[PDB]
């Protein structure tokens, strides 16, 4: 029983570590949106 509970808590760690990486690549996707707007401002500064 202790071995099967160790594997349950191990899976719960993996669920948290997956949700950290999932939230982080949602964050980098939003941070590539922000950089795409910065590049459009730098192009408008060039044509200025």
């Amino acid at each position: 029983i202790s071995q099967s509970e160790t594997y349950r808590r191990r899976r719960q760690e993996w669920e948290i570590q997956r949700n950290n990486a999932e939230a982080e690549l949602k964050q980098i996707d939003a941070q590539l949106k922000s950089l795409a707007v910065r590049r459009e401002a730098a192009v408008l500064q060039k044509t200025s």
């Binding site: 922000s34 707007v37 910065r38 401002a41 408008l44």
Partner: protein, 48 residues
Amino acid sequence: TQFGSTLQNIIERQDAEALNALLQNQAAELILTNLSIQDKTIEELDAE
């Protein structure tokens, strides 16, 4: 000679005001780009 001095002053003064109208038309065209740059500044903060 007095007509020539008067004519010389009018030529100087039409070129000072042809330039002055040129500088304001250039300032009016340049401010449109800075409005679009500032829109990308606000759009960046919405992405942030």
